[PDB]
Amino acid sequence: NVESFASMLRHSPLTQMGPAKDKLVIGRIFHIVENDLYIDFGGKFHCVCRRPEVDGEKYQKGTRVRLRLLDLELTSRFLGATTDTTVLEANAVLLGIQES
Amino acid sequence: TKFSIYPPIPGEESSLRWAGKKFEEIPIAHIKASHNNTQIQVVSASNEPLAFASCGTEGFRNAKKGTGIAAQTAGIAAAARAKQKGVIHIRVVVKGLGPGRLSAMHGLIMGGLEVISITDNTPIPHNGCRPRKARKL
Amino acid sequence: KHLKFIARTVMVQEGNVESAYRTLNRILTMDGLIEDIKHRRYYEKPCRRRQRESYERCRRIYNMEMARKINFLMRKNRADPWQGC
């Protein structure tokens, strides 16, 4: 008796999230390049958010933050492009640090 | 107060005044800016001509009439002649896209007149008569 | 026949005649009246007018698509996060 893939997909938190628009998620800053923070939130792609002007130094690698998701994958189809063009990153708004 | 670019509506009493006169009574400076000439005429609110000027009347002739300086001179002369009759504030009604379209107004400013409103009355035919064929140049 | 000093009329604010004239010119340009007069100076033959309108529509569509593409791609215009690789 082993759980099937269908059951895992049905009960996955990402599946329960429904649409990713304006959803509240908890992400982790796994990389910092100057004032750009790369946050993984359990999705396929991370998201790049600018360091906030207030308490910016309080954000470091591993800091847990709250994000308002706009889209898991940023894709667009241009004129004559047979396939969608993606930037391999998500679109989210950095609300701020999350405290347990 | 809050300034509104929209002109005051005739028949409605507005607080705006100029020399104790209402907007409906301010004299009218008609400007026509052709490509070869520019004409300026001040009239009263009752359509009484008070002053007239043009590039040709100011001595400029042929191509020299098309310059903006000629329109500025015409505006200066028209403003002087109107001010001789007591004109102080004017409502500018400009038509045509001649080079002097703006310069004439400057002349009026240089002439001593005060412009309180700028109106465009360029004759734009809503698909009227057929204009001449394009120049083969 | 219409009432006068309503259409294409701008009130001069504190004697700033130049600013009022600029606003009036911008209003006419936004409404396309200036271009209308310029095109109506000489007759534009119907085939020429149709060609020009089609070209303008195609140019606007292409410009909008290119602007969208540039805005989409400029999101990646940031510091290299994996320098040295």
Next chain:
Amino acid sequence: PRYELALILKAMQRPETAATLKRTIEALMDRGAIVRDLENLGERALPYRISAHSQQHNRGGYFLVDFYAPTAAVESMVEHLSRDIDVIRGNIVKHPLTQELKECEGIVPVPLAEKLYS
């Protein structure tokens, strides 16, 4: 069918306007129209100067005569409104209430690229 006559009448005294309205409705009835209703939108300045019967008008009274009439009557009615003097202007339209509102569900989007080749 159901027609609506938009009638701009010369700004006159109330008895004159009553006489003009009665005459116009009488003409409509003579041509065969069953007048459903008569409305008044008030007396107001015209949006532009209108010249009619060698006279220029700046103000007028607005009325709407809703009625039913045989089609062949409508043209005749127009002619009558042309020959009346107190009528600044008169236009008979198909009644808008006979034009049902086929509900729009929304604006269906279309990709912009195809517009170049389509």
Next chain:
Amino acid sequence: SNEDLPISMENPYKEPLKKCILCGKHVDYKNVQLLSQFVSPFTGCIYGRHITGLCGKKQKEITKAIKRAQIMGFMPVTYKDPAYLKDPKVCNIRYRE
């Protein structure tokens, strides 16, 4: 064969189409106040759909109503009626300064 398999149905999360502001409302030529909202205050030019944000059907209806009102003495042609200069601004255009 198993309950966990996905089922076929219309997208339940599908948000409704953003109907035009006049959708479901009867545009009339006698309603000069509504019609004037879509014309240029300084020239009376009818605004395009990219300015009014109206759907094609409603844009055509507004245009036809405006033309009918203009030709039937209900609406000024060369300018917006000054009595309606303070109506709610629905068109996406900015003129002054």
